[PDB]
């Protein structure tokens, strides 16, 4: 279908022209290879007497034939004081271009040799130097990036600090317990969820077997996530259309504490609200994000509808309890605002979606694999797609601020 490909490119051209109206910040960067994963690291540095701050991303590569890498990248973001750079006028477009219109703001800092594509990479909250990765093989890997060179050996020899065993297939779900240092959950296409405790690894060993294996799902487990306050609770979602809440203290690992028929299709992602301890979201192939209360899982609270294809990722804002975002197979990324649920709309606005749909990011031209909210700069998002594009963006203030 060459016509749809032509339409997408023409629609991108319209979105690009519009950016100064809708964004305070928009950067588009072409990675050497596409990344399946994206997570902002928590640290930020503010060098002396300069107009920018430096933030960092955990990324990966997706090469079919070539050497893949675990990647750490730096991103410069402008301070509120900063001056406009007017040295890049363009007579064709009739514009100066904003912050990061040209190369200079994004850089690859570290590349660590990694066997196969990086399906997902997530840092350990208690020690951001530690990064777990999901590979196309069964072995979940842990890297302490300070124990590695910044520039890799060209042999491409993958030498992880730990190799975590338990699974029979690859997966995507990866979640560190923010209250129990070293406790990692993993989901897989083998229908299981594994749990490792790496806080007390003997003698500087290199392999670790799974402490527990949860076997409740009857299909591919797509995502897993710890509760953010309760160290024994965690959720999982799967192609069996189910949301499961698990208790690690329970003696039966084949049955969850609770099971819910959450969707009319595969459930691909979940995320706990970081402010409200009972709220969580799930995304699905039925094109909806569902909202849940842990204290009554029989009743779905709400359904966010508008997405034009399957949803694979969902994340809450780290700064605003009412704000979340979702992405998937369609090129658009949606930002929702639950406070605006039920607000009456004119028919003209209702054509574009329900009132709780705050923003549609149209900067990508291919399936979005992952995105991450910047924990230190409110409203900044990093999103990555299958065509190599990485965008760091921020919608215009007046969209969310009246």
């Amino acid at each position: 279908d060459a016509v749809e490909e032509r339409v997408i490119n023409e629609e991108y051209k319209i979105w690009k022209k519009n950016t100064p109206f809708l964004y305070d910040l928009v950067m588009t960067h072409a990675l050497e290879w596409p990344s399946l994963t994206a997570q902002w690291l928590p640290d930020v540095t503010r060098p002396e007497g300069k107009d920018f701050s430096i933030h960092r991303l955990v990324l990966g590569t997706h090469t079919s034939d070539e050497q893949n890498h675990l990647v750490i990248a730096s991103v410069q973001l402008p301070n509120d004081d900063a001056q406009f750079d007017a040295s890049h006028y363009d007579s064709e477009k009739g514009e100066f271009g904003g912050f990061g219109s040209v190369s200079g703001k994004i850089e690859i800092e570290i590349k660590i040799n990694h066997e196969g594509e990086v399906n997902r990479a997530r840092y350990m909250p208690q020690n951001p130097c530690i990064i777990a990765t999901k590979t196309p093989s069964s072995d979940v890997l842990v890297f302490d990036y300070t124990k590695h060179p910044s520039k890799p050996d060209p042999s491409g020899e993958c030498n992880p600090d730990l190799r975590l065993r338990g699974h029979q297939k690859e997966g995507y779900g990866l979640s560190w317990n923010p209250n129990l240092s070293g406790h990692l959950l993993s989901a897989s296409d083998d229908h299981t969820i594994c749990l490792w405790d790496i806080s007390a690894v003997p003698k500087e060993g290199k392999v670790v077997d799974a402490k527990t294996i949860f076997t409740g799902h009857t299909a591919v487990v797509e995502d897993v996530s710890w509760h953010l306050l309760h160290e024994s609770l965690f959720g999982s979602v799967a192609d069996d259309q189910k949301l499961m809440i698990w208790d690690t203290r329970s003696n039966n690992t084949s049955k969850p504490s609770h099971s819910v028929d959450a969707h009319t299709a595969e459930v691909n992602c979940l995320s706990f609200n970081p402010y409200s301890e009972f709220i969580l979201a799930t995304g699905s192939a039925d094109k909806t994000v569902a909202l849940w209360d842990l204290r009554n899982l029989k009743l779905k609270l709400h359904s966010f509808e508008s997405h034009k294809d399957e949803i694979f990722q969902v994340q809450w804002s780290p700064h605003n309890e009412t704000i979340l975002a979702s992405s998937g197979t369609d090129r658009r990324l949606n930002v929702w605002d639950l406070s605006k649920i039920g607000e009456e709309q004119s028919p003209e606005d209702a054509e574009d979606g329900p009132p709780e749909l705050l923003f549609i990011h149209g900067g990508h031209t291919a399936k979005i694999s992952d995105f991450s909210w910047n924990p230190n700069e409110p409203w900044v998002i990093c999103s990555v797609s299958e065509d190599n594009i990485m965008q760091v963006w921020q919608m215009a203030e007046n969209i969310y601020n009246d």
Binding site: N18, L22, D352, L357, L358, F359, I360, N398
Partner: peptide, 20 residues
């Protein structure tokens, strides 16, 4: 720049050009 109605409208209509 634009009214609340128009800025919201542009926020949910990514692929339609913005005019004044």
């Amino acid at each position: 720049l634009l009214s609340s109605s128009e800025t919201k409208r542009a926020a949910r209509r990514p692929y339609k050009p913005i005019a004044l």
